[PDB]
Design a protein around this nucleic acid. Structure first.
Ligand SMILES: [Mg+2]
Ligand SMILES: [Zn+2]
Lengths: 98, 1885
RNA sequence: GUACACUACU
RNA sequence: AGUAGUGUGC
RNA sequence: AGUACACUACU
RNA sequence: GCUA
RNA sequence: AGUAGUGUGC
């Protein structure tokens, strides 16, 4: 996408499109993500709270994964995705990161 | 396929219990595949996907004013229609595999539309588009419809349908009713292959033995089963069913006893441990001491490397004459009196030129100028030695042995006792001695001390300077490691040894018996005297400080001379083919070191180089005895269950003559112990499932295992590499015929002498050796024959038509080959002639027997060896064979041929024990061809048999098995342990978790002991006699053949018995004289042993039956335990891979492992097999089928063997063809998961070896960089000896055209206008008219003039449309012409007929005119014996075939291509004839004359448009590869966590010709289609011949050679006809199996190109590669493509990404404003997104984007109505408590009645056809239905029914009254299925 | 179609 | 030598 | 009676 | 083995 | 000397 900026309070969603560490659909890979990867998005020009600026994000529950052991003689784990709890949104992952 | 609908079909399959409803599932699956292809094709055409529109709707859409009162169009419905340019196109989609349905529906539509065609005054084109689902190929019928659509972009996958078809079939496999349902037609047989049987069979003594071996009722069953005629009887299976129901009692009791053995087993299986390995080692060392002569003295060692080395002296000149003077003055100056020192001083005096260097160089340069002036050799001028000071110089570095300067005693002592001219157990060194191993360890430490130091040289060479950029940007660490190799003394040592051995071979070619020669290298200290195959040499090293020499046990003595020391090695005598491997050793060294080192920082490079300097330079058996048993020792020590003690105690025989053998033996011994200790350090990677495919599988990459050959930690893939790679270090053909022929004869005769005495009975019951359980065999064959021939009904048709039984024998490529075959006759005169000529040659050679074998031997069976095609020519000329159908002739030779003879010879393989190979006579080939193809096409049906799988796809079959077993294990452990793991959610939960169901995965990697020798051949009689697709007379003849085949004789070879009658001592227990009765006959009757590989498919089928019995035993044994099991068993000829997955609860896993291995041994023994327990190992993770691994679902292969064959042999034709074959060595490595940097190392080594062969290394005399406008060899084309510069994905895909292709892509990237740069290749080739040529670089002008005048033609034009492709172009330019004689060829019959035809009076022109008037048999085979005989006669006019018939070795070809490098060998007139309108010419003046001529030619824009039109725009593969390289976008780097196997899709998606190419050329040689229509194929071929003007160019060439010659030439005309029909043959060409190992699975074509570019860029990670625009074209192989693709794909990706980004990441309350702000204001992939939205709105698939078309205001009712037809669902109403309304798409029912009785029912449809009524009744009565219709009514016409199904199940669907009665009759067949009526209820209006 | 090379099972 | 392939050259 | 030729190098 |  | 070998070969 080659598109002019899209400022929304304190985020550039164009930079969210161009991001590579924050477009995962797992809740854990965004919750455990880095501040360097989030510092790409910030473009404020005068807000006063992160909670007021993060309103322009998703409130739907993400599809995270839960790995269980298999109980076999070559023992291993089998991971898979799964809808999380009402709290496992995208805004909550960004707030925990912050 | 819309995953929800996928899941509804899948849950519709899992719930199936009836055999009557799976037919409905199959029909729904086929129509779902059909309309999926319809939607995708109407998408790629941008036409509206209509369904079920009749003709009347088409008429009122085209002509909307007529009423149907005028006309009645027929009520047949197309798939779709299209009206454009006042033409109606009736379109019909097919997903068939053959055109048989297409032609009949074409006839139907065309016939029923010719009436309406000329009434409405519009033409009606009938278009049929058929796609093949296994290999996506479009076949559009209308050649006018393709003019509308020049480019068609379907890229879809039909494997989500193949999966459901195969799992539904294997669910309902053993049922017979459903197999009758999925029958194509009926069980039909053809005409008989023979009209009468063989009554001599019943009186045959082998049949008498076979019959009296069996008890009486089995005798009667066999007697009546041979005579069963399946065509006469009512059902074909009424014999198989009879014998199955006979033997079912004994079968079931055996399976139940073997299943009850699960409780008798204790958990003590054959584990490895250090105790058993130590005891096996003790028994081994005792056995080896009793076999060998164990030595303790260190000076009995053999040379580990046949070379000593010293470093270079910079203080001396590296001039050749100065080094010659230094060598002579340093040999003369030896201080001391050793044994041979006077001979060394005398040889130093014989080469003393004093100081007359100028006279020496003048004389030698004059001789070399005389030699290089001719193409031939200089004849009839003798060479005189010139007296130079103190040297009789004969040539450069060739000195006479002067009898005045050496004493006769010293000369005799030197040539007798040092050179070995004229001069009882094998003596090996004690590998278990402490002092011997300690001396070995000090040898290795001393070599590491000298060779690890730096050189003091630059590391610049050919490999580094020319490929280091590629190697470096693939991986910086590979570049650093290769640099560190090139800095040390290892690389200088092995480079000096390669250069010195190349000089030794170049020097010893023209050495004489009285001359010695001197060979030099780039090191000014290391020399070599070549003494007078068997090259004898001695290395001489001048070194300053004593003890500063590399000595791998080869030194004779270090001596004191002036100005330092001098060391001379012992005299080494080697073969030419061993010195050949020595020359190529830097490639082996560098490959081995970089492959061992790769991606492992725990290893030290000096350790790897120290090991690999000895493994890369070992050309003796002493390491062959260690590298192949190392696999079995280390893997059996690593495994769960093995008999490594038995392998060491019985089979490991180390043969340690060298000290490196002793060192490596201690490495193997330590690694066995260490391999046992570390098997608990193998972990599994966490598996990501998706319910669709497995990503991230395999084995974890932790370095915890101890390395084997050198200290360090290592991971499991690298550990298996260290185990399995050293076997490919071994050379091939290190065996001597004199010893391996006696070894093969001994092992055959020992097995036969064992079986003549000890093996008496044939059948058993208690698993005795070489005996078969009869009842189990018979019942298992009955079951598997029933299953296999009940799958497919036309199986005899498939056998006859896939193997050409009805055709002539001259059309089968195994009967017309050039391999050896045996023949028996009175061949006395020819053998006496060749014997007296070879003795005459011997005595003439020594001036400057067969008859003693014949007279001593009375019962000598006389023979001679012949090629196969010559034997066929002889049998056709002597009228033994005819051009009748071949299978009748085979059935006649099955009676007419009684005595079978077989001789043998050695394989000459790299195994320590060589393998026997049997050559049989031609009639045996015919009969075993018949038997084996009958067995083959049934092994094609069985999924467990793996020879029938075509090559290397077995690596993908392994992955499919492993993935289904992981999925089974996951689902089974989640199902069985469901309630326990729910009750989990602390002392109370652990003991709860101890009682749950635990899993077990077991993998048996089995081999079989003596698969062909110790095999009961009598079970194959029961395989033949039970076969229902044969006639009784055919069975009778085949069994009579096998009865005669068991009475076969084994002729011992004549050279073997030459070397046994010249033996002069009676051998102790001569088994050869025992079996041959003291050598009075050369033949031995072999009975049981059926040679080798003669019966691969038959034995594989019976082995698959054995594994079926084993599978059934394990199923019953586990269902005794109330647990689940999945057994897979892949069966090759004898390699077996059984994988057992068990989830049970009752007993421990050790008891199950012990039971399973006991029962595997027993199940192999019940069928006459025997599991090789010494080589059979059991693991958890590692599968190992035929050299193919599967680690935990991730496929794995040793790519090191394909890397190590990059210095292999070749044809040695020219500098291009050698490079071509060596690059093919690296492409196969890339297929087997090689990293990119090691692939570039292999490509570099390939170029290095090729330039070494022709003296083209940088600086040498054939180096082309000083002759062309180029700054490096990357800027010289490959044809003119440049190096290959292309991306690695491009090299792997197209291959060797990637040089030209990548050069043209670079020119496009450099010179196109800026606005056309991020576009397709077709849109950029159209901008060549805007190029200016005055600013092209001189390199670019040169390389285009190469492509314009030496690759293409001068008469070509930029406005042509159908020029040739790269495939129709020979690529060589500079090939050396060798002056050779043909050969002997006296032994051939057809060659004698050829020589009788040359001396015939004007007879050869009849042959030429018969070839020319019937020209198609210059490129293909002939249909009858006349065509074949004239082709066989004509093939002797080609020289290259005649030199192919005479045997040659690649070493002599190599030496000749070295030495003939400065000769004039390039016929430059053949190159000059290429363009505009002397003798031979060297390489350098060919370069000069070529660059002289190309400066005179001109190059304009029209010529570049010719170049781009003929290299790129022809071929669709070149278009899509250029588009992948231009338009690629790289993505996110990630590791290769789960690799997978994927086949290469074909890039030429569209086909024009639908007959076979031989048939098309045979029909083009006439003007008559001879078969279905062929009106299109001949006119496509005629358009191709006329539009590129092949015929006129051929006429111009024959006319100009007529004008040059004057007399009417025919041989040139046949060369022109041959080239013409070659070009036509590659034009028609109507595939391959190229499976790769890629980081994900590639389903489409563009996904395969994405994974090929994403894999081959870095070693460490892989990238996600998406493309800018459509990277495909519209087929039409030799046809231009001037039309690009509409960018609808970009619009699809854009709005799919936008909608899913917007509802995944953006807040929900503001998503429409986000969408508007995207659409109005952004751009996706350089295209404005408003334009992509306009593309979607103007398209015909707006129904895909319904949520996008809403929230923006562009959506209307036609879209929703269109959409509704697609995804149709079911709607119920009315659960009040009496009328139901079940509505669907154009399908609604209304049902009126009480609880008891229903009054009437009204269906409502769109069309009233009896198919659609039952379909609608099935779908509308499958949802929520109040009740179960529980009453009946008498019934007369459609009704609603129900059948009962066990435990409260019913099926609800509408039948006809007639169909109610018919299905009640069919389920009232007398059977086992308990009968359920379809008791019918209420009437359906 | 012929020739050559390679891998794999015998 | 039979097999199963793959790739090169005419 | 003859039987004909490569490397020649940063070392 | 090939050439005079 | 070298190569091969519990079959003498080269
Ligand atoms: Mg195996
Ligand atoms: Zn701010």
């Amino acid at each position: 996408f080659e598109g002019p900026p899209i400022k929304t309070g304190l985020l550039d969603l164009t930079e969210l499109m161009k991001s590579q560490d924050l477009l995962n659909l797992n809740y854990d890979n965004i919750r455990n993500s880095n501040l360097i990867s989030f510092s790409k998005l910030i473009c404020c020009e005068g807000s006063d709270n992160i909670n007021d600026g993060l309103e322009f994000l998703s409130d739907d529950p993400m599809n995270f994964t839960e790995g269980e052991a298999i109980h076999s003689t070559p023992i291993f784990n089998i991971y898979y995705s799964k809808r999380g709890e009402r709290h496992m949104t995208y805004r909550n992952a960004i707030k925990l990161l912050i | 396929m819309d995953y929800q609908e996928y899941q509804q079909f899948l849950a519709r399959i899992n719930t199936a219990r009836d055999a009557c409803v799976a037919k409905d599932i199959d029909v729904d699956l086929l129509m779902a595949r059909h309309d999926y292809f319809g939607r995708e094709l109407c998408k790629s055409l941008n036409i509206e996907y209509r369904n079920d529109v009749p003709f009347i709707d088409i008429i009122l859409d085209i002509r909307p004013e007529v009423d149907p009162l005028t006309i009645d169009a027929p009520h047949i419905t197309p798939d779709n229609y299209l009206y454009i340019n006042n033409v109606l196109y009736i379109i019909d989609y097919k997903v068939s595999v053959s055109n048989e349905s297409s032609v009949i529906t074409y006839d139907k539509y065309y016939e029923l539309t010719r009436d309406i065609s000329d009434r409405l005054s519009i033409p009606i084109e009938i278009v049929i588009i058929r796609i093949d689902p296994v290999s996506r190929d479009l076949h559009i019928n209308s050649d006018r419809f393709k003019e509308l659509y020049p480019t068609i972009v379907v890229d879809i996958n039909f494997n989500q349908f193949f999966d459901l078809k195969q799992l539904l079939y294997e669910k309902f496999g053993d049922d017979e009713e459903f197999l009758l349902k999925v029958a194509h037609g009926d069980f039909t047989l053809t005409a008989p292959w023979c009209k009468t049987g063989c009554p001599e069979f019943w009186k045959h003594p082998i049949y008498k033995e076979f019959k009296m071996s069996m008890p009486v009722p089995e005798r009667r069953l066999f007697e009546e089963s041979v005579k069963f005629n399946a065509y006469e009887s009512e059902r074909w299976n009424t014999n198989l069913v009879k014998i199955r129901e006979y033997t079912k009692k004994d079968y079931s009791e055996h399976i139940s006893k073997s299943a009850k053995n699960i409780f008798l087993a204790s958990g003590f299986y054959k584990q490895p441990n250090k105790n058993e390995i130590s005891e096996g080692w003790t028994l081994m060392v005792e056995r080896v001491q009793d076999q060998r002569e164990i030595s303790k003295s260190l000076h009995d060692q053999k040379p580990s490397i046949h070379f000593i080395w010293g470093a270079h002296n910079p203080g001396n000149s590296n001039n050749a004459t100065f080094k010659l003077i230094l060598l002579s003055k340093s040999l003369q100056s030896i201080k001391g009196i050793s044994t041979y020192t006077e001979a060394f001083k005398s040889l130093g005096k014989m080469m003393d030129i004093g100081d007359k260097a100028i006279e020496y160089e003048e004389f030698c340069m004059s001789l070399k100028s005389k030699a290089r002036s001719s193409w031939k050799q200089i004849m009839n001028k003798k060479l005189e030695p010139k007296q130079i000071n103190n040297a009789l110089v004969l040539w450069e570095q060739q000195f006479m042995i002067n009898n005045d300067l050496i004493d006769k005693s010293e000369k005799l002592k030197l040539f007798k006792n040092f050179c070995g001219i004229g001069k009882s157990k094998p003596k090996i060194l004690d590998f278990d001695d402490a002092n011997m191993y300690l001396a070995s360890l000090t040898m290795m430490e001393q070599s590491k001390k000298i060779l690890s130091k730096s050189n003091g040289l630059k590391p610049d060479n050919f490999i580094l300077n020319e490929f280091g950029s590629r190697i470096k940007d693939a991986n910086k660490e590979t570049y650093d490691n290769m640099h560190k190799i090139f800095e040390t003394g290892y690389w200088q040592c092995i480079s000096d040894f390669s250069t010195l051995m190349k000089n030794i071979l170049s020097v010893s070619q023209y050495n004489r018996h009285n001359t010695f020669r001197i060979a030099m290298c780039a090191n000014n200290n290391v020399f070599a005297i070549v003494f007078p195959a068997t090259v004898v040499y001695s290395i001489i090293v001048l070194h300053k400080e004593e003890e500063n020499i590399f000595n791998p046990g080869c030194l004779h003595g270090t001596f004191k001379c002036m100005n330092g020391y001098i060391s001379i090695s012992r005299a080494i005598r080697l073969d030419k083919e061993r010195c050949q491997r020595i020359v190529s050793s830097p490639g082996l060294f560098l490959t081995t070191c970089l492959l061992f080192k790769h991606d492992n920082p725990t290893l030290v490079m000096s350790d790897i180089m120290n090991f690999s300097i000895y493994t890369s330079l070992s050309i003796t058996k002493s390491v062959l005895s260690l590298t192949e048993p190392a696999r079995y020792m280390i893997m059996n020590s690593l495994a769960i269950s093995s008999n490594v003690k038995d392998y060491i105690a019985e089979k490991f025989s180390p043969y340690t003559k060298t000290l490196f053998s002793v060192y490596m033996t201690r490495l193997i011994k330590n690694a066995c112990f260490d391999a046992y200790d570390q098997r608990q350090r193998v972990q599994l990677r966490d598996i990501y499932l998706s319910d669709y495919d497995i990503t991230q599988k395999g084995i974890k990459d932790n370095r915890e295992l101890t390395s084997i050959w050198f200290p360090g930690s290592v991971t499991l893939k690298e550990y298996l590499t260290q185990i399995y790679l050293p076997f490919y270090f071994n050379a091939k053909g290190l065996h001597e015929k004199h010893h391996v022929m006696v070894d093969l004869a001994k092992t055959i005769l020992e097995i036969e002498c064992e079986q003549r005495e000890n093996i008496k009975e044939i059948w058993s019951t208690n698993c005795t050796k070489q005996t078969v359980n009869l009842k189990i065999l018979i019942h298992s064959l009955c079951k598997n024959l029933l299953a296999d021939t009940s799958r497919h009904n036309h199986l005899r048709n498939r056998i006859e038509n896939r193997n050409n039984f009805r055709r002539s024998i001259t059309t089968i490529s195994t009967f017309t080959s050039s391999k050896s075959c045996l023949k028996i006759g009175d061949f006395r005169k020819e053998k006496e002639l060749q014997s007296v000529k070879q003795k005459k040659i011997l005595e003439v050679q020594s001036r400057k027997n067969y008859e003693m074998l014949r007279n001593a031997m009375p019962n000598y069976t006389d023979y001679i060896s012949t090629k196969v095609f010559d034997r066929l020519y002889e049998l056709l000329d002597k009228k033994v064979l005819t051009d009748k159908p071949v299978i009748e002739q085979i059935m006649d030779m099955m009676i007419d041929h009684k005595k079978f003879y077989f001789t043998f010879f050695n394989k000459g393989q790299k195994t320590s024990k060589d393998r026997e190979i049997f050559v049989g006579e031609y009639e045996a080939k015919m009969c075993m061809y018949a038997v084996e193809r009958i067995a083959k096409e049934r092994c094609k049906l069985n999924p467990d048999e793996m020879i029938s799988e075509p090559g290397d796809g077995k690596l993908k079959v392994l992955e499919q098995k492993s993935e289904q077993e992981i999925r089974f294990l996951v689902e089974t452990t989640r199902q069985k342990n469901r309630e326990i793991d729910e009750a989990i959610e602390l002392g109370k939960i652990e003991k709860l978790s101890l009682g749950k169901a635990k899993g077990l995965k077991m993998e048996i990697n089995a081999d079989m002991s003596k698969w062909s020798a110790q095999d009961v051949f009598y079970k194959y009689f029961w395989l033949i006699a039970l076969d229902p697709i044969l006639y009784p007379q055919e069975k009778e003849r085949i069994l009579y053949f096998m009865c005669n085949y068991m009475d076969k004789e084994l002729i011992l070879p004549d050279e073997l018995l030459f070397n046994l009658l010249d033996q002069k001592v009676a051998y102790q227990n001569d088994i050869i004289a025992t079996m041959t009765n003291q050598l009075n006959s050369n033949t031995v009757l072999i009975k049981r042993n059926w040679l080798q590989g003669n019966f691969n498919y038959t034995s594989s089928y019976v082995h698959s039956c054995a594994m079926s019995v084993y599978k059934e035993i394990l199923k019953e044994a586990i269902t005794l335990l109330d647990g689940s099991i999945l057994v897979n068993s892949l069966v090759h000829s004898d390699d077996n891979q059984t994988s057992i997955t068990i989830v049970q609860d009752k007993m421990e896993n050790d008891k199950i492992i012990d039971f399973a291995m006991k029962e595997f041994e027993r199940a192999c023994l019940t069928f006459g097999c025997q599991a090789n327990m010494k080589k059979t190992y059991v693991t958890n993770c590692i599968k190992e089928f035929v050299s193919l691994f599967n680690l935990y679902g991730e496929p794995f292969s040793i790519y090191g063997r394909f890397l190590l064959t990059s210095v292999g042999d070749c044809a040695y034709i020219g500098p291009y063809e050698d490079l071509a074959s060596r690059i093919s060595s690296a492409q196969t490595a890339i297929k087997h998961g090689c990293p990119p940097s090691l692939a570039w190392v292999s490509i570099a080594i390939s170029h290095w070896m090729t330039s070494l062969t022709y003296n083209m290394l940088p600086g040498q005399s054939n180096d082309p960089i000083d002759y062309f406008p180029a700054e490096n060899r990357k800027d010289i084309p490959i044809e003119l000896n440049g190096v290959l510069d292309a991306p690695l994905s491009m090299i792997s895909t197209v291959g060797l055209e990637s040089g030209n292709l990548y050069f043209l892509i670079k020119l496009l990237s450099k010179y196109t206008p800026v606005m056309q740069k991020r576009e397709s290749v077709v849109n950029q080739i159209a901008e060549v008219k805007n190029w200016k040529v005055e600013d092209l670089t001189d390199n670019e002008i040169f390389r285009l003039k190469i492509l314009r005048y030496l690759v293409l033609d001068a008469e070509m034009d930029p406005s042509d449309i159908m020029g040739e492709t790269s495939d129709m172009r020979g690529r060589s330019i500079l090939t050396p012409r060798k002056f050779t004689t043909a050969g002997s060829l006296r032994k051939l019959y057809s060659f004698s007929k050829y020589q009788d035809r040359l001396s015939s009076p004007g007879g050869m022109v009849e042959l030429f005119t018969y070839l020319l008037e019937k020209p198609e048999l210059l490129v293909t085979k002939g249909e009858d014996m006349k065509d074949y005989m004239e082709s066989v006669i004509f093939r002797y006019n080609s020289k290259r075939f005649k030199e192919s018939l005479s045997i040659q070795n690649p070493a002599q070809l190599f030496i000749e291509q070295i030495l003939f490098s400065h000769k004039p060998v390039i016929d430059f007139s053949g190159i000059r004839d290429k363009y505009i309108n002397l003798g031979k010419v060297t390489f350098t003046e060919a370069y000069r004359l070529l660059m002289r001529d190309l400066s005179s030619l001109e190059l304009t824009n029209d010529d570049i448009q010719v170049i781009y039109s003929y290299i790129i725009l022809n071929d669709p593969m070149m278009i899509t590869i250029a588009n992948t390289h231009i338009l690629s976008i790289y993505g996110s780097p990630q590791r290769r966590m789960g690799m997978s196997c994927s086949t290469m899709p074909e890039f030429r998606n569209l086909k024009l010709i639908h007959h076979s190419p031989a048939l098309v050329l045979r029909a083009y040689s006439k003007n008559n289609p001879d078969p279905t229509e062929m009106a299109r194929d001949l006119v496509h071929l005629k358009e191709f011949v006329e539009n590129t003007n092949l015929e006129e160019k051929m006429k111009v060439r024959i006319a100009m050679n007529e004008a040059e010659k004057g007399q009417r030439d025919i041989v040139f005309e046949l060369k022109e006809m041959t080239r013409f029909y070659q070009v036509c043959y590659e034009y028609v060409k109507s595939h391959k199996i190229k499976v790769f190992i890629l980081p994900a699975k590639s389903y489409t074509t563009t996904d395969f190109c994405s994974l090929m570019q994403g894999n081959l860029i870095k070693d460490k990670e892989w990238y996600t590669v998406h493309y800018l625009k459509q990277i495909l074209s519209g087929g039409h192989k030799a046809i231009m493509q001037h039309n690009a693709t509409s960018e609808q794909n970009i619009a699809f990706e854009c709005f799919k990404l936008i909608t899913h980004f917007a509802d995944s990441f953006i807040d929900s309350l503001s998503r429409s404003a986000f969408l508007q702000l995207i659409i109005d204001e952004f751009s996706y992939k350089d295209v404005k997104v408003s334009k992509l939205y306009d593309i979607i709105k103007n398209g015909y698939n707006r129904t895909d984007f319904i949520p996008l078309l809403f929230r923006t205001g562009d959506l209307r009712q036609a879209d929703l109505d269109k959409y509704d037809a697609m995804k149709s669902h079911e709607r119920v109403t009315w659960n009040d408590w009496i009328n139901l309304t079940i509505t669907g798409y154009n399908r609604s029912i209304t049902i009126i009645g009480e609880d008891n009785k229903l009054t009437y029912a009204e269906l409502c449809l769109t069309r009233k056809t009896p198919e659609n009524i039952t379909i609608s009744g099935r779908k509308l009565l499958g949802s929520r239905h109040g009740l179960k219709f529980e009453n009946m009514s008498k019934i007369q016409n459609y009704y609603i029914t129900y059948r009962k199904k066990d435990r409260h199940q019913f099926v609800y669907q509408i039948h006809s009254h007639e169909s109610i009665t018919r299905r009640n009759e069919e389920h009232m067949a007398i059977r086992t299925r308990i009968y359920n009526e379809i008791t019918p209820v209420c009437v359906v209006n």
